Amino acid sequence: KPTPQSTFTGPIVVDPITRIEGHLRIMVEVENGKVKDAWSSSQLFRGLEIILKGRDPRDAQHFTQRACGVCTYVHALASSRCVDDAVKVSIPANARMMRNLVMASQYLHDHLVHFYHLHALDWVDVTAALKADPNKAAKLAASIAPARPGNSAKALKAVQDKLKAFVESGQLGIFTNAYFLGGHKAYYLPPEVDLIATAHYLEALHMQVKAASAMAILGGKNPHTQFTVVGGCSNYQGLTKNPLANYLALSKEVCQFVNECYIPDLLAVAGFYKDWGGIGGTSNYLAFGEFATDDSSPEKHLATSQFPSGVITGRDLGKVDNVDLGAIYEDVKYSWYAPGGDGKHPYDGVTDPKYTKLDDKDHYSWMKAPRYKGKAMEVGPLARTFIAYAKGQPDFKKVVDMVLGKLSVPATALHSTLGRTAARGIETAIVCANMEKWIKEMADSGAKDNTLCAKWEMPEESKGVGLADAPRGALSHWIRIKGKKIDNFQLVVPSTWNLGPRGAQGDKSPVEEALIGTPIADPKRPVEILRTVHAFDPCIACGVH
Amino acid sequence: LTAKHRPSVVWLHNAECTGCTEAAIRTIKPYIDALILDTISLDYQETIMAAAGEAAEAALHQALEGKDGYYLVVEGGLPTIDGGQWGMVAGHPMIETTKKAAAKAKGIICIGTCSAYGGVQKAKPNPSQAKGVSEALGVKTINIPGCPPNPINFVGAVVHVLTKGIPDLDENGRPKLFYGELVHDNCPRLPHFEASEFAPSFDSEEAKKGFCLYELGCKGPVTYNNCPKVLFNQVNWPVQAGHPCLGCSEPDFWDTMTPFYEQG
Ligand code: SF4
Ligand code: SF4
Ligand code: FCO
Ligand code: F3S
Ligand SMILES: [Mg+2]
Ligand code: NI
């Protein structure tokens, strides 16, 4: 019944954090088997903001997209919203629709790959799946998930035979030295549940191809879409009947996989790890919102996002504040940047790299520390879910209540690594339930009038901000234009909010705070650190840029 | 064959965005599970491997010391400023680990423009002093560029290397199998280009009619890649989506192909 926990006292360093995007080192101090202090240390700088200075503002989206190829598209969208705001163009309704649908397709691809290919191996013992009875596994699957041929005893046995041949080869490949090899106290699942999840892990490798193909019908290609322009979008063909029929068909298949496999696996896994509802919580949440009906300005985005925007402080769901874009700043006191750079609003952002040395407690990360009124903010699916739920958004109320009921927990149980993981699935289901409506809206509008790009003029001097809620959370790009060129271009990215270091007052970031109190069953295989870190869905290329 | 000793592949991530890993897993001939279960032994790959920290570093070293040797895939450029310390894994500069892995590799495949040629972090003013792999380390590489490359090109290259040897390479290290032809030579808008039928803006009726995108900056005429012939994701490519080619498989395109929306 109790959560396994050793008596280990001492430091643990985990570097590389694998099954994330990018290069992260986590350092913790452990006393009597529980984490007592933590540091989130991002280990690569590229400097896209420096590279952009003096370039054509039209080029920004193509450079910033390469901040990250996991959350591909999202930086092209934020940069396009940013430059659209700076030149004061309102994009056509069809462009709003197409950009938002590409964002929806990205949520689907991204969250499915995250749960299965990045997170699941923290919770699922793949080698234990070889001990399962495939007939027992099928019967269990039939009780917790909709009927499907992939969950049959024959299908589960084929997965098991394939895994068997692979493990027995002695070339374990990506499973080499896995934390679950030879059993591990922190892995709770019955072998049958391991096998069902492993079968779906493999299926998801094929399904993510379909999710990306759907995205590419509108986006041109995946990764790194190529269909946005200043003023709107370029892809007239994406408004036509046959491409949209194919986009719908592929989306429906992906959503069937979300509803049949992802959500039931997520619930089954969460059911066994209810103790993780009491580990890894934080208190403050931020979202810029996504899927707006009016994207004519950043203020209209914040106001009309269907996944709503807002600020929650101190877990107080009774008081959702509106976002104040002027309250955002970034500190560098504990980061690898030059002195003097603390407290900068992104319009006045500075990016002056200055490395010291590995594990220097005074400067330990290439990420800046974004703060909001002096507080750290968690961003991402859990932030969006709490904000929507507190505001009474009807799809979030329904799906959140469904989960709380299934797990038999109060909403406060969601301030945790388990809640963070559940929230990712909750919103994936909600995006899926909206796809057909959004596709019909664009098919009808695009048939009526295929206007997709507005006319615009480059100003000599201006500023603009582009907001998006990307799969990992609140994303903002900020431009100052001078002499029709980029004078300043600052990215403040969801993983910067979640996984940056301490701010100017020495206050831990959300992941640093979340790691305090983590139990460690075996300090040589600290899967519990990975559970919380992975729940934030880190992207270090995003966070540092 | 799954149960056989499959050729070892070590995949290193340097200064990268992981778009190349993402591209590789879009493969359908074969799908990625079939590749790693049946064809190769993928022995280190940070994005998807189970082990983390010291256990992952132990897996890398087991692979580098394997009796049968290994092939090396590199994703991302090498940041060289400050002794390589601006890009580190397990407390070691990326340039050091890549140098070590390259020295004993049976073959080196650079996936993406970043590892091939330096890529986005090398763009002016190059704050990290980033280099391509051959640029930094002086080793011959098989380059599979593009930002990212088509999985057809990367997986095709991997399969060629294991089955046939080094494919014929052009002056930029790119297999002629995939990079022998200009994007433009296979573009369905080529008749519009020949007839000087160019879209003057993205809102124009010429754009709606699918006219050539040269006047809006298309770099297809100077870019070697197979995009229009094979497509991406079995469904599309940028010009079919109404957008100019950026030249993303060309060395240093960030500085040679910009501004992207002009020919200037
Ligand atoms: S080549 Fe492009 S897609 Fe690949 S790692 Fe570099 S920036 Fe990312
Ligand atoms: S759109 Fe680009 S690749 Fe196609 S014909 Fe015109 S210049 Fe050539
Ligand atoms: N989602 C995503 Fe990537 C991060 N963090 C961005 O923006
Ligand atoms: S931008 Fe790149 S993906 Fe092909 S169409 Fe041009 S070479
Ligand atoms: Mg920034
Ligand atoms: Ni990312």
**A387, A424, A460, B7 from A384: Cα distances, Å:** 5, 10, 37, 45
Domain count, chain B: 2
Bridge partners of residue A470, in order along the sequence: A473
Domain count, chain A: 1
B46 lies in the same domain as B135: yes
A49 annotated to a ligand binding site: yes
Catalytic-residue membership of A345: no
Which of B178, B197, B217 marks a domain boundary? B178
B24 lies in the same domain as B109: yes
A324 Cβ contact list (under 8 Å, min separation 6): A311
Method for structure elucidation: X-ray
Nearest to B144 by CA among B95, B107, B94: B107
| CB A258, CB A112: distance < 8 Å | yes
B155 lies in the same domain as B205: no
Name the active-site residue from A41, A42, A68, A305.
Answer: A68
| CB A538, CB A498: distance < 8 Å | yes
The CATH number that applies at residue B258 is 4.10.480.10
| CA–CA separation, A255 and A257 (whole Å) | 5
B146 lies in the same domain as B211: no
The finding on whether B73 has its CB within 6 A of some atom of ligand 1 is: no
Which of B178, B202, B234 marks a domain boundary? B178
Indicate if the alpha-carbon torsion angle B172, B177, B179, B184 is positive or negative.
positive
| CB A251, CB A105: distance < 8 Å | yes
Please provide residue A532's backbone torsions phi and psi, each rounded to the nearest 5 degrees.
-70, -45
B117 lies in the same domain as B27: yes
DSSP tag of A455: -
B172 lies in the same domain as B148: yes
| B137 close contact with A: CB closer than 8 A | no
| CB A338, CB A325: distance < 8 Å | no
Nearest to A225 by CA among A208, A209, A213, A207: A213
Please provide residue B11's backbone torsions phi and psi, each rounded to the nearest 5 degrees.
-120, 120
B214 lies in the same domain as B123: no
| A252 close contact with B: CB closer than 8 A | no
Chain B residues inside the 8 Å CB shell of A236: 207-208, 210, 242
**Token digits for B162?**
């294991």
B136 lies in the same domain as B35: yes
CA A221 to ligand 4: nearest atom: 3
**A77, A525, B89 from A471: Cα distances, Å:** 13, 29, 26
Q: What resolution (Å)? A: 1.4
The CATH number that applies at residue A498 is 1.10.645.10
B161 lies in the same domain as B187: no
Task: Indicate the burial class of A246 (C-beta count within 10 angstroms; 0-12, 13-18, 19 or more).
Answer: middle
| B65 close contact with A: CB closer than 8 A | no
User: The domain containing residue A108 runs over which residues?
Assistant: 1-545
B101 lies in the same domain as B120: yes
The CATH number that applies at residue B96 is 3.40.50.700
DSSP notation for A201-267: HHHHHHHHHHHHHHHHHHHSSSSS---EETTEE--GGGGSHHHHHHHHHHHHHHHHHIIIIIHHHHH
Which of B118, B147, B178 marks a domain boundary? B178
| CA–CA separation, A437 and B49 (whole Å) | 38
Neighbours of ion ligand 5 (CB under 5 A): A 491
Nearest residue of chain A to residue B113 (CA atoms): A66
| CB A472, CB A494: distance < 8 Å | yes
Enumerate residues 166 to 185 of chain A having a beta carbon within 8 A of any beta carbon in chain B. Answer: 166, 168-169, 171, 173-180
The finding on whether B246 has its CB within 6 A of some atom of ligand 4 is: yes
B169 lies in the same domain as B183: no
Out of A51, A69, A209, closest to residue B28 by CB: A209
User: The domain containing residue B237 runs over which residues?
Assistant: 179-263
A184 annotated to a ligand binding site: no
Task: Indicate the burial class of A312 (C-beta count within 10 angstroms; 0-12, 13-18, 19 or more).
Answer: buried
SS (H, E, C) chain B: CCCCCCCEEEEEECECCCHHHHHHCCCECCEHHHHHHHHCEEEECCCCCCCCHHHHHHHHHHHHCCCCCCEEEEECEEECHHHHCCEEECCEEHHHHHHHHHHHCCCEEEECHHHHHCCHHHCCCCCCCEECHHHHHCCCCEEECCCCCCHHHHHHHHHHHHHCCCCCECCCCCEHHHHCCECHHHCCCHHHHHCCCECCCCCCHHHHCCCECHHHCCCHHHCECCHHHHCECCCECCCCCCCCCCCCCCCCHHHHCCCCCCCC
